[PDB]
Amino acid sequence: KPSIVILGAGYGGIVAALGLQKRLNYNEADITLVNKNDYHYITTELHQPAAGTMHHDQARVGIKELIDEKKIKFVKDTVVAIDREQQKVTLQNGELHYDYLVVGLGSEPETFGIEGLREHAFSINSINSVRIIRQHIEYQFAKFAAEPERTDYLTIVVGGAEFTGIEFVGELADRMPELCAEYDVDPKLVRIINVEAAPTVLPGFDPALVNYAMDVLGGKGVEFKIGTPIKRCTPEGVVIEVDGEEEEIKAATVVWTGGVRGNSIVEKSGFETMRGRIKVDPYLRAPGHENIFIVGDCALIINEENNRPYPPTAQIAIQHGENVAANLAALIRGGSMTPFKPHIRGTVASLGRNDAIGIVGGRKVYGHAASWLKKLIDMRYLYLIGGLSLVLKKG
Amino acid sequence: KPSIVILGAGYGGIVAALGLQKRLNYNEADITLVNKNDYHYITTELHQPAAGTMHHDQARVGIKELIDEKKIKFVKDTVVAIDREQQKVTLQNGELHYDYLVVGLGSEPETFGIEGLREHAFSINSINSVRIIRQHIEYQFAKFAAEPERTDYLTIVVGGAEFTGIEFVGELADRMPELCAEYDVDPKLVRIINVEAAPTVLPGFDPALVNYAMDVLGGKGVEFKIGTPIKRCTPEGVVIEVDGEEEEIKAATVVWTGGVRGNSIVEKSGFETMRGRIKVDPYLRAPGHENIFIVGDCALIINEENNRPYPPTAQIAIQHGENVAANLAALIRGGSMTPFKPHIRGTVASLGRNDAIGIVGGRKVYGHAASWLKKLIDMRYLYLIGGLSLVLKK
Ligand SMILES: Cc1cc2nc3c(=O)[nH]c(=O)nc-3n(C[C@H](O)[C@H](O)[C@H](O)COP(=O)(O)OP(=O)(O)OC[C@H]3O[C@@H](n4cnc5c(N)ncnc54)[C@H](O)[C@@H]3O)c2cc1C
Ligand SMILES: Cc1cc2nc3c(=O)[nH]c(=O)nc-3n(C[C@H](O)[C@H](O)[C@H](O)COP(=O)(O)OP(=O)(O)OC[C@H]3O[C@@H](n4cnc5c(N)ncnc54)[C@H](O)[C@@H]3O)c2cc1C
């Protein structure tokens, strides 16, 4: 038999595994799915638990429930490195050998060599992380009542005004009243600050949506510093440059949404990467390797319409997964492989549980309609991986 | 005038103010009650929020509801100092003058000058404090899944196996399943440690009850280090001396139930204090001062029947309150006042929602019945201070 190894159980990994599961009958191939955890988590919702608006359990599902144990063998371990030449993968407590390999380890934060960011800041990239963020913030608010001289406890800074950062501050803003009610804090003293290097909030968005969003969040007490870059980060706070002069913000909680790069494991294993990602062939496989397929954030692709790269998104990762499943199933059988054609719909961004901005159907949706739309789109994924039972289990 | 000032709205203080209000007709005297916070909190329940077993809002009640504006005037500020000679009290945002004074600012943690205890440890003495403790523990558990190498995060050390410490570890133990369930932590790796200098846990109680309690908590995964004293404290953990050698415990959370002393203001105000507390006359009044009365944890008293001192407790503080109310009313009226004789009921200690130990009525009650007994006794105070509305609201 031929042995297929899939790394990571993220969007690309899980869609690939489930697809392979559907395509192949028993004994056609040996399939192993490797993930750091026994669960796969819905990354797109991760902002919600981080704020504390939603329980983290909604964002994750157990892998054992998702798959057939006869078809796939599941491994709970951490990837340390990949060796192409030896054709083996090295894990913390194991090693594997693959006839065919699928790589979807997701992304790692991009700090752009900003001083102290990696050490002293938080990121929304996992269940553990959002848990830590949420309880961190709750802890500081708990601490405020003891010494109210220290208003830094109430200050929360988000780095980057890109998609993730804006969703997160929206959730935080919606979260704030209940939190202050819990910890006996005057709502006025709380500061939520969004700091972006770029001159505009939400680049890659129609200005109409952006200003509407700024009206909503600004109405909710959010503060925006734009054209302002983070000079450095310290346990005390952050230091930013305005009008070519240094200014210091003393904040207990600093969260970094500014940028993302591919997993370090990919670059560290001798691949060549632009921004940590690999520019793959029309069949989504690494250049010079017929036996390795790449998906999600680790993969790089460019649009025909403009010589600019497709952004790293859940949706494109899903498409990657289905395509790779099809191609692998065909390839082991000696069949013809299909090239990858990306079909891209529009994305909706939440401004809290009740509010959103989006471009869907080439239309400019706002408010409740946009929010409900986003929820429906997200439900479509749940239907995809787990079906009616999975969707019903949420709500 | 005559002007009466009460400091703090703890058990003694609030019972005192309520007592005066019940006792006196309108316009008879000027009474002002001062507290750092707009609420009075049921200290007796404070261990529960610290574990996270019970929401904190239950443990506190707003003061304004309790008293009648016209009878009493409330000031929300923090006492900074007392000047006996000038007969004045100094606050952060005010100053007050008293014909008669009542002091019940409660207690402050006693660390016995142990290195780093005040800096690096937690105490269960206020709502804010228990909130900080609870969220601290939750924070460590949240941190754990990211790095499971660090088991110190899961370790919680409690100093003292006295009444408070035992209740607290009991609550933590009952708390543990839900807590471990939330943050993806194996229940086994969790350590709860109770550390006492004394050779026995829970001194001053009949040994049978003690053995039963150790059986319960020990069954619940609680660990006891007895005859072992804490040498010093670090943010990483604590250092204790066992078998004539230093031993290092790596624990993220250290909670101190070991000792209590009177409020620092008392020592700082020119009083003469044994353990930061004052030894009062039979009328519950400060020595050398006819216009000053002391209540609660700030007060010190001795039993004739046994040459041992009365401990600082809620119930005795309440008795202080009623006594001071009656005596004060007499003093304003010019009548003869009653000396203070304390009558003591039995005390019950919880081991969680499902278990308790008590010596109420000399029956030495154990288990579930004891728990219900404690709940009823706790309800009695609520009935006293607020009436039907307060008890129903819980
Ligand atoms: C708040 C937030 C909101 C978002 N909303 C949207 C949206 O609305 N629409 C949209 O299209 N996109 C959205 N995205 C982007 C989208 O979520 C990501 O692009 C997508 O998750 C990436 O797909 P992936 O499977 O390759 O990465 P991942 O989902 O991160 O896959 C990583 C998986 O592999 C595991 N893993 C990682 N490293 C290792 C390792 N060394 N060893 C073993 N296992 C490892 C991880 O535990 C995880 O299981 C959002 C992102 C964020 C942070
Ligand atoms: C976990 C715990 C459990 C307990 N369980 C029991 C039990 O089961 N049975 C029993 O009999 N006793 C029990 N006790 C003891 C009892 O709760 C205390 O002894 C009681 O508080 C004594 O009355 P107090 O008014 O002096 O204390 P406090 O209630 O603490 O009075 C202090 C009040 O004054 C305020 N204050 C303090 N300093 C200032 C300042 N400078 N300026 C203005 N305001 C100030 C405080 O905020 C507080 O409101 C327990 C104590 C603890 C910590």
Author numbering:
A (entry chain B): 3 to 397
B (entry chain A): 3 to 396
Which of the paper's sentences describe this entry?
NDH-2 is also much smaller and simpler in structure than complex I – it comprises only a single subunit and one flavin redox cofactor. All of them are homodimers, with each monomer containing two Rossmann folds that form nucleotide-binding sites for a noncovalently bound flavin adenine dinucleotide (FAD) and the NADH substrate. Our study has revealed how the NADH:quinone oxidoreduction reaction proceeds in two half reactions (NADH oxidation + reduction of the flavin, and re-oxidation of the flavin + reduction of quinone) that occur independently of each other and use spatially distinct substrate-binding sites.
G164 is positioned next to the adenine-proximal ribose of the bound nucleotide and I379 is positioned at the entry to the quinone-binding pocket. Structures of the two mutants, at 3.2 and 2.7 Å resolution, respectively, confirmed that the structural changes are localized and the integrities of the structures are maintained. In comparison with WT, G164E and I379E exhibit RMSD values of 0.54 Å (Cα of 395 residues) and 0.45 Å (Cα of 393 residues), respectively, with no substantial additional differences. For the G164E variant the KM for NADH increases drastically to more than 1 mM, consistent with the mutation compromising NADH binding. Furthermore, the observed rates drop drastically (only ~1% of the WT activity is observed in even 600 μM NADH), and, as a consequence, the apparent KM value for menadione decreases significantly because the turnover rate is ‘capped’ by the slow rate of NADH oxidation. Figure 6C shows that the reaction between G164E and NADH is very slow (~0.2 s−1 in 2 μM NADH), similar to the reaction of the WT with NADPH (~0.3 s−1 in 2 μM NADPH), consistent with weak nucleotide binding. Conversely, when NADH-reduced G164E was reacted with menadione rapid oxidation of the flavin (~175 s−1 in 1.5 μM menadione, matching the ~200 s−1 rate for WT) was observed, demonstrating that the quinone-binding site is fully functional, irrespective of the functionality of the NADH-binding site.
